[PDB]
């Protein structure tokens, strides 16, 4: 994709060289100086934009970081507060593991059913799949587990509350991820910046050819590489739950989560 | 926007057909000064759009919190008082009323339909009497939580747990109000817009000396880049203004309503 | 201050002396190209951008702090209604302190006299207590804390519900510090010092380095460049005094009225 | 200004440039503006970022100090509100909190805490504090014992103990925040190399400037040198916000304010 | 031999090559002006500026994370004394776990062996149990959690006071999560890929563009412009791996020492 636009730029430079003979005749002059202005303007704009994209990526990485943290500490509190309640341990862990996988699926816009069935009773799978938000439902069921221990008097209102906070933290992760997935910043205004860099890159050799002659392709490819490299990297970072090269290894992240939670509950991968 | 590009092409054609008369009289326009001007304008547009983007992001975050806090509040009600479905349905009404009412507040549109749909007509009059209707809804949601505590169904601890979620909604209300009765750059936003507008119309006259017939092509391309970047900032600066795209706000209020009905088993339709 | 129209007009005068003294240039041997003024102009524009950023942030923080007053006081009034709906005497006392706090904080930041307002809202005993302090607004918080505190001794609030309302006072305490910190810590003077020199000197020497290129079109270009750098410099001017009384500053009286109106709407037996 | 030295030194180099411009072709030395435009702008961009990074450190340092005032204020309020009678505890706790500020200032300035410590506390304590290589942390632990004892005594519940405990946490965070900004500087490549670069650019600039400016060069080069060197030295100043320079923090004024605040009116309250 | 001085000396040679070969330009048909190399270099600087910005923030984040370790450990030991002044048995056990956590984290981020430092601090029954887990640092927190848990079950801590100390474990959990997130997820390798190529190629081709305008002045001006760009680029590289072993990286050994000495001073050791 990047190499296609680079090859088309080498070609366009040749078009500029072979048709430079016609330049004076057809009545067209093109200096470097105006293209330097527009060039720098674009660079400034790509610089800010690209930084904005990196921010989103870092936030996305961060939210997933919190899934692991919150889940670890929720399991920790369960063990420290109710060390004898290993039934509750196992079931809650099931939901927390389910939550992660379901979040991966949600963000990937794929089917959660395989993973859900692996981890949970089929009655719960139907309840979870029935909801507009399966991750929200999973949190509600994990909520019932601690909520029932509270009714049984095995948790106090304080110790229920400490565990409730972690579910609250997971709610916040889910909200943040949902926010980052459903936020393409006006669909037109990324396509409009892209068509700008593109149109600048292909008109540049035409302007460069006066000053450079046969060097035109070598300089024009180098400039275009730089600008396109930057533009496309910003594109990858913008959508961090995607399946692109420089996007979050969400399946690996989910494995780490499950393994951690299994390690904490005396069980073996 | 497309008017201003057509105005630019018109200004370019003027600059071609008049280049002869004026540059001979002793009035010249080089590219080097308009390059300094344009780069500085770009730098300023760069920083400007940065401030704009951050207002846009804060708006998204605040609205994200509505979703989050309302969800966790309804979770807490279900987990702490599994039996109290009448309380569940009342609190869910206000929470959904809160979202629509806040949207209507920011967009400066009429909430009446949404309130009449969600709430008892006594409550709707109380809410519509107030000069701060969104706050009033929050207060009502409060009483429901308060009555449950008074009835001994919530302890001070568990009342407290739900109370935090109402604070979170309060923070969202305020943050939004501050992002609405705005901006913080107090109508300089019209000066930079004109600074761009004038720079784009004087530019063909600076460029024609170097480009002759190519001028309308190169001048419109530059103008496009600057005017687009300026337009984007203006759009982002004002996430709740009467001209903004209302899709995501509506999408948000719909999401939460749907979520909440699901959470209280009002969905799906019974078999 | 609209010195922007003075300096724009001084710039026209600076172009005029440049056009007519342009002959006496090579005689002396003084030449001024655009190129090194592009380098300087760019460098000045970067530093102007980074500075205006700081200026902007400080203004936003001022808004946020004031925004929190409204939030924390709304919620503290709410809490009192839902937790103690019978206790309208306590409601009215706490409310009057909260309103007092807002007004007192405004007067403090504006360096004006809070006495009139305090006396409108509070008992002369309390006014005396507040004004006796070297930190009046902080003392109002202490008094508001005392009402909440009494309710706790009386047993109308548990340690838990006491705690829920204390946090709101902690928030108003962060507003108070915030505002104080802002009022005493400007964007460092050096910035606005350095930049005010370089931006003015630049706008002055510019028509001199443009006339060689522009002959007669020097006023209309040097002005348009100058207006651009000065607009952007004066934007920082109009954003660095958020607590003032100027048109561009925060409408703190209006905000205080908004606060008072809000807390009165929340009370009235309904 | 160490700038006034290097600004005059720039004028001397810019005379050398005016006299040498004939001999350029003799010595074989062509030197256009455009390469130094590229290098200058690159340096401006890097100065902009560096300076922004420094201001951040300034701002964070200021904020952490702000929290000291806030947290200490509310912790006194909490004691005045929850235990209104316990003045001996109030007085003891306040003296530790005041010790905390001065102690921290001395820690960050690397000066002797003993003067200010003796002014405020019992001599047994002044030696317990001085015996620890972490004096500020020690003071905190001491303030911690005071609220702890009030709880062993059953004068505070677990809840009301917690409310105060949180405020000591907040101060621990300031301590850590301040230690991080102090013991961790902005890495020495950032300062050492960037200063070489700005100055080496500043000396060479007139040599490439003559061709265009002829006689005007010493002015237009000093103006450029001012702009660049000002920005770099200001960055260098703000990087170390607990230092003693002009644009650094008034740490002495701040601890005076903290003290005046806690001790307001012989420490008497309504 | 120091990467930076080598790439400078390659650039002084690139300049003499450009001087000696300037004659052949006219004949071979290769015209190279400064104007487009200004556009290129400026763009590269902007992108270098923004990139360096990201690398700095990552370094700063790592610093804050370690700052929190010290803060949270200090206040947890402080709480232990103020709430349970008699229970020095528990003080010593918890302090040893808290010091273990610091060292374990250090070793984890350094990909080095925690055994020596852990054996120095803890009983053998514990050290093997901890090292048996694939998440040893997380395991140490679960064990510190247990101490707090036992003290609660023994009635020595109330639910409230248990809560107060539990939040301090939560804080350490976040540090661990944050640190792991920084160690495993780098600043996207595309940033180094793109910018290392583009800077190097730009510095190399530059004298060939400068030579027409600068002649024998070329080497001096070219090495200077190279130095400015290469220094900035390598500074970003040194800031990007803050858990490394360089002198420019975080003195993690010093910090862990400060932590240990700190918590021993607090208990009377
Ligand atoms: C309400 C009380 C706590 C106030 C009292 N004047 C003290 O002292
Ligand atoms: Cl956590
Ligand atoms: Cl387990
Ligand atoms: Cl929440
Ligand atoms: Cl229901
Ligand atoms: Cl609140
Ligand atoms: Cl239900
Ligand atoms: Cl009332
Ligand atoms: Cl506080
Ligand atoms: Cl009322
Ligand atoms: Cl802490
Ligand atoms: Cl001990
Ligand atoms: Cl001890
Ligand atoms: Na906790
Ligand atoms: Zn022609
Ligand atoms: Zn957490
Ligand atoms: Zn178990
Ligand atoms: Zn929340
Ligand atoms: Zn229900
Ligand atoms: Zn022409
Ligand atoms: Zn549904
Ligand atoms: Zn709040
Ligand atoms: Zn009332
Ligand atoms: Zn003002
Ligand atoms: Zn606080
Ligand atoms: Zn007292
Ligand atoms: Zn000369
Ligand atoms: Zn903490
Ligand atoms: Zn001990
Ligand atoms: Zn023993
Ligand atoms: Zn080993």
Residue numbers in the entry:
A (entry chain C): 23 to 291
B (entry chain E): 24 to 294
C (entry chain A): 21 to 290
D (entry chain B): 22 to 291
E (entry chain D): 21 to 289
Text lifted from the article:
Eleven of the 12 KpBest mutant structures were solved, while 10 of the 12 hBest1 mutants displayed altered channel function.
Although the structure of hBest1 is still unsolved, two Best1 homolog structures, one from bacteria Klebsiella pneumoniae (KpBest) and the other from chicken (cBest1), have been previously reported. Overall, the channel is a pentameric assembly with a single ion-conducting pathway, which varies in diameter along its length and is constrained at two narrow points: a “neck” contributed by three residues (I62/I66/F70 in KpBest and I76/F80/F84 in hBest1/cBest1) on a transmembrane helix, and an “aperture” formed by a single residue (I180 in KpBest1, I205 in hBest1, and V205 in cBest1) on a cytosolic helix. Here, by electrophysiological and structural analyses, we show that the neck and aperture in hBest1 are both indispensable Ca2+-dependent gates, and their dysregulated opening by rationally designed or patient-derived mutations causes Ca2+-independent leak and elevates Ca2+-dependent channel activity.
